[PDB]
Amino acid sequence: MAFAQRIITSNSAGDQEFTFTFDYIKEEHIKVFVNFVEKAQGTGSNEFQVITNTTPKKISLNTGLSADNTRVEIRRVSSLSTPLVDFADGSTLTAADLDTAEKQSLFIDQELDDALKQGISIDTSTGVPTLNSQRLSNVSDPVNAQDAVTKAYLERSGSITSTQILNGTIVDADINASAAIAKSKLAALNIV
Amino acid sequence: MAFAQRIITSNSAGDQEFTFTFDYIKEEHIKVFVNFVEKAQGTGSNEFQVITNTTPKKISLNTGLSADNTRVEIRRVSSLSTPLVDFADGSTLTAADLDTAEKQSLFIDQELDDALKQGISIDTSTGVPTLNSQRLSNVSDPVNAQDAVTKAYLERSGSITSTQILNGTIVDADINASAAIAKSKLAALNIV
Amino acid sequence: MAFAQRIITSNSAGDQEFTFTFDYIKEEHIKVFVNFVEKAQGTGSNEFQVITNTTPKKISLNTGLSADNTRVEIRRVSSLSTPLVDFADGSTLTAADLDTAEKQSLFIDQELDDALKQGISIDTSTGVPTLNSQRLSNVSDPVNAQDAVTKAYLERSGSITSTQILNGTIVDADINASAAIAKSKLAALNIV
Amino acid sequence: AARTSFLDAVNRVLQMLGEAPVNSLQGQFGLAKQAEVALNDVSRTIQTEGWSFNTDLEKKLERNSSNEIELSSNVSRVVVDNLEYPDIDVVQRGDKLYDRKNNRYTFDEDLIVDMTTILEWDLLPEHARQYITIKAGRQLQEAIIGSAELTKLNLTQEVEARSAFLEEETTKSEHSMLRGHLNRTSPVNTYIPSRTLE
Amino acid sequence: AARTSFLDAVNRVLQMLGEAPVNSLQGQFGLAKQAEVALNDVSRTIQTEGWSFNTDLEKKLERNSSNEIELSSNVSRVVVDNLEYPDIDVVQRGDKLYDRKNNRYTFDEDLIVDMTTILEWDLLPEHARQYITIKAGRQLQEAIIGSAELTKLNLTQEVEARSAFLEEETTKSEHSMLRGHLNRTSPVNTYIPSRTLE
């Protein structure tokens, strides 16, 4: 399963609290997203706070949900910019510092694995990549002979060419009645 | 090169010995997959065994393959959920523990990097991570406009609409001769 | 901003200086790429050196570029195949070694995250994977059309299926003037 | 405060033996191998008896191309109900079932059995972990040192641990006499003569 | 964690004796061979009694040309049904049967007997493996060193192991008193007096 994240599709407007199960080192390592908007941490004016007293722990929002079916994501990120423990000479080493370093490293690796799996992984069914029923988006207009095709590039005016046509399926149902077709470009039925 | 994963297509049925070159920590950290089937470690009815008395070290199945060209994969995955060291107070700190912790961290990072490379990897000359001669699949039928097309969608009944056709190619090469084409739905003609 | 990479499109030909901001441990960990061609580090027969005397640090080449708008890439990479610091028994512990080990681990994690981001990300506007408007190539032909359609397969003569063309837009734009359309393929209009 | 880990169990076993705690398990330069083998052996000995947390009900078994049933590597015991199969008597032998009555290694149809598996350390519950740790420490000390006072203290601790583990198991899995054989789907209400008289 | 193997059993016996573990079993240079011999001897001693997993019922025996019954090298005991054969009773002697009533070594037709076989270490089930291991360890320790308190401790462990083994056997085989001698096919439903009263 996902190691340090949980994605919830809300079910009722006005709710405030959502539960989460994974572990963490410091409270400021928890991030909350509301409808693709990152949510700041704090209290009062800040919109959410963490309740670490009840099992399982849950996060409480200071303002109720405006509309139901609004996605809320709880994901843990450790400090990727600075080490959590600094060693200085003359200090008596204790197991707490070493354990903190080990937990930081392991949690960072777990989160990286989670992100890699959540992205485009490899479908083990045939050993091929999969999107897991997603939509590929923001792909530039193909140029090279081996790119993928886009709906925009396929549907832009004049996209289909003469070589892009194979005969046999000029359906009469979709043939326009009001179309103006010159007789020179037309065929000649052989009426016996 | 592939740091900690070797995938081999079995040449002939009945073969049982395969070789590997990556380093490891424990004999239980090596996993073998055979076309999605998972094989348990051990000896006896256990369907694969490890051999270390010969360089390079090699694994051995306990039953020959039924058919040739069956994919066999050897991958090393160190512990991801449980640390290999947990410092306890009152012990005698030795360099072996620190070296083992360093090795575990390095091996985890190597395995994650190799998994990312095994996935879709950046196409340097272009920029999008190329599938590298693989059939991306397991994408559901299109739901929105920009969603890509699948086989069961592009070959599905009812996909014929009134937009994408063009002119300049349609000939007798594929039009059914025995088909009764409506004269009125067909085009015009002047017989001079 | 990527932690440990920077891509520069040369403003003009003949320049030899390029700046960078990220920190590092050893200068041997700095790789310089130009036009997807790797250049060695050193002096004389080499192509580039590293100047750390000023701030911010910059790298200098031994020869100017041939043409303007040339791709120049500078990215850090730490030692993956060997731990930077090994612990020996029978000596005095120093905080410098522990700090160096922590720095190496953090830098490797940063670099891996940067690689994943420069590869495949998830857009924070819709939550679907995005490519940041790049170009995809080296994709094998879709044996099943579950795969994204390759434009070579689209534009290949006769590769278009009869259902790929959707009748309804018949005009005189693309019928060739001298196209000898098979006469027995269209009827006549009901001329009164 | 998470559950007990393998390293904590090894440290506890060493401490009960009377030595200094060890830092880790990997590449150790001490008694880690002895502690590990003791813990594994005691875990296997406890598991091979069959409890409520390592038993599957009405599991289907499938034969191979030669009408032969092959068990997995970690299957400890296999039970077949007598009443459902009045003509077939099976007993486990190595890793294959044996048709005792007909003196054959072959069968005519698939079976519905209930088997007991041996679980890894990570998947055990807390009370099982505690009992396993204490028993392993007692056995290791008794086999290695052989003193008197340490043996007495370990005996007392082991007795207390066994009492606690058995009590936890029974209150968790609510064994009953009225229900009879558990393979029957519960028809019992267990109505309470202690409540409804007012 | 698979079932106990030969190398693990040998290491366990050596550890119970109190001597360092061995690396392998082939081409070793220690007491591992003596431990193997003790294991084999205790295995034979236990198996020669006749339990649920090593007894074949209704088995048919075939004679050779000289009208004699020959037994394999690993056959421990045979029993014939007195009711089924009134005028002939047999007792095992070496590898041949003796018709002690008629004082002849020759029979007239084939027999339908119950046979008990001594099995190799591979085919033995888990509880039998554990009991064999503990018993062999105790016997070898007594033979090598010769203490008394160590014998007391090993006797305690052996008693516990025997209790566990017997409980496992009686839970597996499901013996009964109503059914009588098992050579008759089960007509008993063992209908439960407890539950079906509501």
Author numbering:
A (entry chain O), B (entry chain M), C (entry chain N): 1 to 192
D (entry chain v), E (entry chain u): 2 to 199
From the reporting publication:
The portal-tail complex of P-SCSP1u consists of dodecameric portal protein (gp16), dodecameric adaptor protein (gp22), hexametric nozzle protein (gp23), and hexametric trimer of fiber proteins (gp28), in a similar organization to those of T729,32 and the MPP-B cyanophage P-SSP723. By using the symmetry-mismatch reconstruction method, the asymmetrical portal-tail complex of P-SCSP1u was reconstructed to 3.8 Å resolution, enabling us to study the detailed assembly between each subunit. The cylinder-shaped P-SCSP1u portal, 170 Å in height with the largest external diameter of 160 Å, is formed by 12 copies of gp16 that are arranged around an axial central channel. Similar to the portal protein of T7 (gp8), the portal protein of P-SCSP1u is composed mainly of α-helices and can be divided into five domains: C-terminal helical barrel, crown, wing, stem, and clip. The clip regions of the portal provide a basis for connecting 12 copies of the adaptor protein gp22, which bridge all other components in the portal-tail complex. Each of the six fiber trimers of P-SCSP1u (gp28) is fitted between the nozzle fiber dock and the adaptor fiber dock. The platform region of N1 tightly interacts with the helix bundle regions of A2 and A3 by two pairs of hydrogen bonds (R766-E20 and D737-N24) and one pair of salt bridges (R766-E19). Collectively, the dodecameric portal, dodecameric adaptor, and the hexametric nozzle in the portal-tail complex are intimately connected with each other, with a total of 60 hydrogen bonds and 18 salt bridges, providing a stable platform for DNA ejection. The succeeding loop of the dodecameric portal protein constitutes one of the narrowest sections of the channel, which was previously identified as a “valve” and suggested to function as clamps to retain packaged DNA in the phage T732. According to the radii of the channels, an additional narrow “valve”, which we named valve S, is identified in the P-SCSP1u capsid. Intriguingly, an additional gate, which we named gate 1S, is identified in the middle of the nozzle located between gates 1 and 2.
Here, we report the cryo-EM structure of the cyanophage P-SCSP1u, a representative member of the MPP-C phages, in its native form at near-atomic resolution, which reveals the assembly mechanism of the capsid and molecular interaction of the portal-tail complex. Overall, the P-SCSP1u virion possesses an icosahedral capsid with a diameter of ~600 Å and a short tail of ~190 Å in length. The recently identified MPP-C (Marine Picocyanobacteria Podovirus clade C) cyanophages, belonging to the T7-like podoviruses, contain the smallest genomes among cyanopodoviruses and exhibit distinct infection kinetics. By using single-particle cryo-EM, we finally determined the structure of P-SCSP1u in its native state at 3.2 Å and 3.8 Å for the capsid and portal-tail complex, respectively.
